[PDB]
Amino acid sequence: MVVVGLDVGYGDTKVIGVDGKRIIFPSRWAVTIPVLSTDGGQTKFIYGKYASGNNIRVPQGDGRLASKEAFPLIAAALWESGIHVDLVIGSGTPLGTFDLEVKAAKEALENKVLTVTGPEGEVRQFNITRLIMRPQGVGAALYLLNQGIIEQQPGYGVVIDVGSRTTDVLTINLMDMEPVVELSFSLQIGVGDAISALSRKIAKETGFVVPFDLAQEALSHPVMFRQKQVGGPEVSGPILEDLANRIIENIRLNLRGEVDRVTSLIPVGGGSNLIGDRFEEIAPGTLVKIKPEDLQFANALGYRDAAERS
Ligand SMILES: Nc1ncnc2c1ncn2[C@@H]1O[C@H](COP(=O)(O)OP(=O)(O)O)[C@@H](O)[C@H]1O
Ligand SMILES: [Mg+2]
């Protein structure tokens, strides 16, 4: 058994390979720097950073592995995973739809054989034995439980997963690491919002259209496109505080009175890299320390862990 843990998110796909190497390609694949192929040859796509264009595929849901917008990424994951196989895949999808979405994922990948072709004519064949699935938010909880960054006890943990499109909050009861369904939800407010809050912002003062990835970067660090130096953090406050507040307010709205049973607050996901610390005020000195580099990967890391435990 090779074990991979995989997290195909609207923005980035995240994968954890052999001896826990961390692959991660932007979640986008257009048909035509590897061309790969699930059809043996007939068909062929670029993925990741090197797909630019108009007829460009993307995920239309978080954690939707049975989706036809997802396959070429999964395929592309098992590529960069580094099998020198018989793999188990550990993954997640949000709690709201957790059950349906597990079902499709098993139909589309359990006991099936993804056959795939890259440069200089190379076949690789993964037989997928099983699919372990855990809700998004739980993946990240475990991994931190395994690392001792959190521990079991009385009270409730709140994993706040800042994503690219959605912010995904999962209230978990520490006694038993079981999610509290009624106290668990998804905002449709992510990082893009801060991004576009910026691309938009540029032209409405500067002049041209500032494209995706400079815009992404610009949230955390300054930029240049056409010898034009647009972007930077002291500007970026007025955005990310709103992004942050919107997220925060919306959490008080959902959680309420029940914000008193909260012992740990657990910023996770890529965006906690900008507005993470800002989340203390929901319930202060319940924050839980996590290495910046571990934030986009807490879930995948935990989906794989889960995979081994069985
Ligand atoms: N180290 C980084 N520095 C600044 N921002 C980051 C960093 N890593 C991730 N982010 C931001 O958080 C965003 C979303 O996180 P992520 O969960 O990876 O995407 P997804 O929404 O697909 O789950 C990223 O797209 C990126 O803009
Ligand atoms: Mg995500």
Curated annotation (Swiss-Prot):
CDD domains referenced in this protein's UniProt entry, alphabetically: ASKHA_NBD_ParM_Ta0583-like (cd24027)
Annotated thermal dependence: Optimum temperature is 50-56 degrees Celsius for the polymerization reaction.
Gene3D superfamilies (alphabetical): 3.30.420.40
Top-level taxonomic group: Archaea
InterPro entries: ALP_N, ATPase_NBD, MreB-like_C
Binding site for ATP: Y10, G11, D12, T13, K14, S164, Q216, G270, G271, S272, N273, Q296
Keywords linked to the UniProt accession: ATP-binding, Nucleotide-binding
Claim: Ligase is one of the keywords in the record: no
pH dependence of this protein's activity: Optimum pH is 4.5-5.5 for the polymerization reaction.
One GO molecular-function entry: ATP binding
Family: Belongs to the thermophilic archaeal actin family.
Role played: Polymerizes into bundles of filaments, forming a helix with a filament width of 5.5 nm and an axial repeating unit of 5.5 nm. Polymerization of Ta0583 requires NTP and is optimal with ATP, but GTP, UTP, CTP, and even the deoxy form of NTP can also support the polymerization reaction. Nucleoside diphosphate or AMP-PNP does not support polymerization.
Note, other: Mg(2+) is required for polymerization. 4 mM MgCl(2) is sufficient to enhance the polymerization; however, higher concentrations of MgCl(2) suppresses polymerization. Polymerization is also suppressed by addition of NaCl, KCl or CaCl(2), with half suppression by about 100 mM, 10 mM and 18 mM, respectively.
UniProt-recorded name of the protein: Archaeal actin homolog
Annotated source species: Thermoplasma acidophilum (strain ATCC 25905 / DSM 1728 / JCM 9062 / NBRC 15155 / AMRC-C165)
